[PDB]
Design a protein around this ligand. Structure first.
Ligand SMILES: O=c1[nH]cnc2c(-n3cc(CCN4CCC(c5cccc(Cl)c5)CC4)cn3)nccc12
Ligand SMILES: O=c1[nH]cnc2c(-n3cc(CCN4CCC(c5cccc(Cl)c5)CC4)cn3)nccc12
Ligand SMILES: [Mn+2]
Ligand SMILES: [Mn+2]
Ligand SMILES: [Mn+2]
Ligand SMILES: [Zn+2]
Ligand SMILES: [Zn+2]
Length: 458
């Protein structure tokens, strides 16, 4: 067995003034951190949120994990455990595996042992992970307002930007304005780990950022790849594991896997590592691949978020989903138009950035409408796309969530195609088709002008 650890990722130690605004600090570290994919943030010494819970009243059913490299795994995904009974099982496993007290096992050893065990055929080691536990039922690790009584120690951490319940609903997040209950992007998720439990190589939905906090326990080991090397990583994984790249029926059937970072390093892909300890944050940047495993019994909380910097990458992602025939979590254009309709109450920096993305959207929509008119589609009718459930407004060909416009025919009731796939609906001549649209070009230009007036306000 031979493992050459990847170089360390950047570690930041902000002052109270720097820490005060999470969004201003993330923008400042961005030129360094986006070159490594992941980064670590150590909060000021005196920032210590209170973690308190009853281990007997907290229940969950965990996922069973087979530890095999390049073996296909489902992204979404056995008995019931309390936080106490899971902890007893987790501690007994680690101490019996090494024949040592749980806290005396070196981190370098657990790391090299993890990579040996995933590559050995004759080893059939299985573990359990309390993964993707919803904060709605289980409750957040951070303080939340309840009508229970909270203590002054919990009061100071209720309104903090670093309390992961607040981060998505702040005015600097663009996901905050989305009316639809997406669930898996504005709400925090909880992770109860044990030795060797792991997360496979992946990127976030819509190429969003992520922020992870380790509340307590043994460290979490991470591997990260910068956003610029994403397609380079994917090509390496297509040659060595082609079975993972096949077309899937929906979002629930996403195929992911465990792969040694030294294999990526050999193929000239940049990889960085970190050991995240209790009380530390890890931030993942847009389109940054990441994977990892737990050193022992621990408790973590995580959430996705989108800044103004992300907006052009978000549009590029939806275009990439269309080429791959992959489902969207939400409509990017619907989010843009929702913010434009609330221009008078938006943050000035936000209004300025939304205005620039909207200008691109309008020019692309104008070109697409001219092309479908030249194909012989003459009839048209306005349609309120936001009222339809998502599974009722997807392109038959590319599976994109339609908002701005779509094509329908009376011969196929309920079916739709996006303006890129007009020839994929039916065998009828295009004069039988109808163009369904949310807004005319005349409705769109004053919406963008409202954003300009708000952005020019000083
Ligand atoms: O398309 C590209 N876009 C951007 N960069 C490209 C690139 N290079 C990137 C670098 C930076 C390497 N450097 C290594 C150390 C690291 C660091 C670690 C830990 C702490 C700190 Cl403070 C910093 C910070 C990134 C050098 N070249 N090579 C090829 C292609 C691209
Ligand atoms: O320590 C880690 N442990 C585990 N995972 C990590 C991870 N990521 C995990 C995800 C997936 C998040 N998932 C999205 C879908 C959502 C859902 C909604 C509605 C129905 C269902 Cl069934 C599921 C449930 C949460 C993305 N990253 N990134 C980093 C670290 C870790
Ligand atoms: Mn094995
Ligand atoms: Mn992730
Ligand atoms: Mn468009
Ligand atoms: Zn389409
Ligand atoms: Zn038809």
């Amino acid at each position: 067995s031979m493992f050459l650890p990847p170089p360390e990722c950047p570690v930041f130690e902000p002052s109270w003034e720097e820490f005060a605004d999470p969004f201003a600090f993330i923008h400042k570290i961005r030129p360094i951190a986006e070159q490594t994919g992941i980064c670590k943030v150590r909060p000021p010494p005196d920032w210590q949120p209170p973690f308190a819970c009853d281990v007997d009243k907290l229940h969950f059913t965990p996922r069973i994990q087979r530890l095999n490299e390049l073996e296909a795994q489902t992204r979404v995904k056995a008995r019931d455990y309390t936080l106490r009974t899971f902890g007893e099982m987790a501690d007994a496993f680690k101490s019996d595996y090494f024949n040592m007290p749980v806290h005396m096992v070196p981190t370098e050893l657990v790391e090299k042992e993890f990579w040996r065990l995933v590559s050995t055929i004759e080893e059939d080691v299985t573990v359990e992970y309390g993964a993707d536990i919803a904060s709605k039922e289980f409750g957040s690790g951070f303080p939340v307002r309840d009508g229970i009584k909270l203590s002054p120690e919990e009061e100071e951490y209720l309104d903090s930007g670093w309390n992961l319940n607040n981060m998505p609903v702040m005015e600097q997040s663009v996901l905050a304005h989305i009316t639809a209950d997406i669930c898996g992007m504005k709400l925090p998720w909880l992770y109860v780990g044990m030795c060797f439990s792991s997360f496979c190589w992946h990127i976030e939905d819509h190429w969003s950022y992520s922020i992870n906090y380790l509340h307590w326990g043994e460290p979490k080991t991470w591997y990260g790849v910068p956003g610029y090397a994403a397609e380079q990583l994917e090509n390496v994984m297509k040659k060595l594991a082609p079975e993972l790249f096949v077309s899937q029926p929906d979002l629930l059937h996403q195929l992911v896997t465990i792969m040694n970072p030294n294999t990526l390093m050999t193929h000239e892909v940049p990889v960085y590592r970190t050991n995240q300890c209790a009380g530390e944050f890890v931030i993942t940047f847009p389109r940054a691949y990441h994977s990892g495993f737990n050193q022992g019994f621990n408790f973590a909380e995580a959430v996705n978020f989108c800044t103004v910097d992300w907006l052009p990458l978000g549009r590029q992602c939806v275009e990439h989903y269309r080429l791959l025939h992959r489902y969207c979590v939400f409509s990017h254009d619907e989010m843009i138009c929702k913010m434009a309709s609330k221009a008078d109450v938006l943050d000035v920096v936000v209004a300025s950035t939304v205005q620039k993305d909207m200008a691109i959207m309008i020019e692309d929509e104008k070109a697409l409408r001219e092309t479908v008119r030249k194909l012989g589609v003459i009839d048209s009718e306005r349609m309120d796309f936001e009222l339809l459930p998502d599974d009722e407004r997807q392109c038959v060909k590319c599976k994109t969530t339609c908002f701005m416009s779509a094509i329908s025919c009376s011969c196929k009731p309920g079916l739709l195609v996006c303006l890129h796939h007009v020839k994929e609906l039916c065998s009828c001549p295009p004069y039988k088709y109808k163009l369904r649209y949310r807004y005319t070009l005349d409705d769109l230009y004053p919406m963008m002008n409202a954003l300009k007036l708000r952005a020019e306000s000083y």
